[PDB]
């Protein structure tokens, strides 16, 4: 295959790395190699950039596809079922370390959706329905908040009768009925006081 002497390592968004052929392959192009979660993916392409498409198959016959944008600022990882056509998951990582990951149900609807900000905090949506509603959970540096999702806004709440909420809408609004690095406040138990 490709190793330390016959390739060059290229850093990709999402802390992935890809190896590229030295000069050129047998029939014109450059060869690409990237290992993602125990599974190494093979791909051919021109450009010698690190950009291109790499594919692979898991032990459970699931198909994996990894496309790297031309400017190398975006990464798309798709997992398909055995038919290579039913989408199981699709994750798009950006150069600024932010990402969106969609998980599809057996009908082809987004049933779970994870949004990772550049700071590392995550916004997780589970049990999404065709209504546009579901469960909402914000993962923070230290604690977890749990709440509900509506097609309108996102409400997160911590609970005596002193139980106040946290609202994030379609856009980047954040109203409270706050920090830019998303938090002074500290950890989970300590929210109930103020």
């Amino acid at each position, epitope marked *: 295959s490709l190793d330390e002497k016959n390739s060059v390592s290229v850093d990709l968004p999402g802390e992935m790395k890809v190896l590229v052929s030295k000069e050129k392959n047998k029939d014109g192009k450059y060869d690409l190699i990237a290992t993602v979660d125990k599974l190494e993916l093979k791909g051919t392409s021109d450009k010698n950039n690190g950009s291109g498409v790499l594919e692979g198959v898991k032990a459970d016959k699931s198909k994996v596809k990894l496309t790297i944008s031309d400017d190398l600022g975006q990464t798309t990882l798709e997992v398909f079922k055995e038919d290579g*056509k*039913t*989408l199981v998951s*699709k994750k798009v990582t950006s150069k600024d370390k932010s990402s969106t990951e*969609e998980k*599809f149900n*057996e*009908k*082809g*609807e*987004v049933s779970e959706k994870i949004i990772t900000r550049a700071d590392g905090t995550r916004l997780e949506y589970t049990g999404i329905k065709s209504d546009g509603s579901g469960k909402a959970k914000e993962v923070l540096k230290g604690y977890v908040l749990e709440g509900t999702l509506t097609a309108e806004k996102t409400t997160l709440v911590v609970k005596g009768t002193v139980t106040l909420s946290k609202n994030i809408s379609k856009s980047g609004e954040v109203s409270v009925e706050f920090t830019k690095e998303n938090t002074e406040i500290t950890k989970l138990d300590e929210i109930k006081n103020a």
Partner: antibody
Framework: EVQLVQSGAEVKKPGESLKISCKGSGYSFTSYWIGWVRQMPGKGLEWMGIIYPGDSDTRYSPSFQGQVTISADKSISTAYLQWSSLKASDTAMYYC??????????????WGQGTTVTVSS | EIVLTQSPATLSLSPGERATLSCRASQSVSSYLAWYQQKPGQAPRLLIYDASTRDTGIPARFSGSGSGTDFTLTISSLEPEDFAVYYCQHHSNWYTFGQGTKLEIKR
């Protein structure tokens, strides 16, 4: 070996009801959406709607909502397209096709051979 | 609504030549664009989905590219059986098909 076979050509009169059928072979019929597509004589293709035969979840295009009923018999891998009162303007070719994805979309990858419906007095 | 526009309405070429077909969307849209071929008296056949991946059995001379607003179907060198109507279809607007491009023989 993956295929969809539609019922034969129909010559009907206006007002009559009609139910045409689409049978799947070679794959898990209840694991995929089945869609219906219209092509009027000399015209392009029109997406009408889809059904998930696993639980008969049905989604219609706003252009065809209330004009047709799409149904499915999960136990014999058959989807159906029906009218209760045919119009002359319903004269067209109708295709069923396997529809890939709701919140993603990979196109319609398997097609029936089509069914001609002629509606005349 | 998001509207698809295929250009040109009629593309007149000959076997051996390169063919480029355009689909443009009135707004920036996702990659979920599919291309179909339909010959007279036949059912449509899927050629490309997700803008750039070829369906099973489709010959290598067909390829798709594009993003945002501009999408292209390219036929590297036309064969006689490639002369047909071509349709695009996107996820938006309830999976609406484009109006179609007729690829005819130039004489």
């Amino acid at each position: 070996e993956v295929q969809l076979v539609q019922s034969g050509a129909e010559v009907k009169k206006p007002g009559e009801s009609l139910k045409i059928s689409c049978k799947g072979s070679g794959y898990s019929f209840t694991s995929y959406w089945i869609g219906w597509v219209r092509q009027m004589p000399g015209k392009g293709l029109e997406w009408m709607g889809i059904i998930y035969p696993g639980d008969s979840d049905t989604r219609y295009s706003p252009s065809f909502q209330g004009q047709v009923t799409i149904s499915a018999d999960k136990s014999i891998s058959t989807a159906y397209l029906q009218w209760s009162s045919l119009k002359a303007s319903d004269t067209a070719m109708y295709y069923c096709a396997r529809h890939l994805g709701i919140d993603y979309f990979f196109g319609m990858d398997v097609w029936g051979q089509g069914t001609t419906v002629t509606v005349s007095s | 609504e998001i509207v698809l526009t295929q250009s040109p309405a009629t593309l007149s070429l000959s076997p051996g030549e390169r063919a480029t077909l355009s689909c443009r969307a009135s707004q920036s849209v996702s990659s979920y664009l599919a291309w179909y071929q339909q010959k007279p008296g036949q059912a449509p056949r899927l050629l490309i989905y997700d803008a750039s991946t070829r369906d099973t059995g489709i010959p290598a001379r067909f390829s798709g590219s594009g993003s945002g607003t501009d999408f292209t179907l390219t036929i590297s060198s036309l064969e006689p059986e490639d002369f047909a109507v071509y349709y695009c279809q996107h996820h938006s607007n309830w999976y609406t098909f484009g109006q179609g491009t007729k690829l005819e023989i130039k004489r």
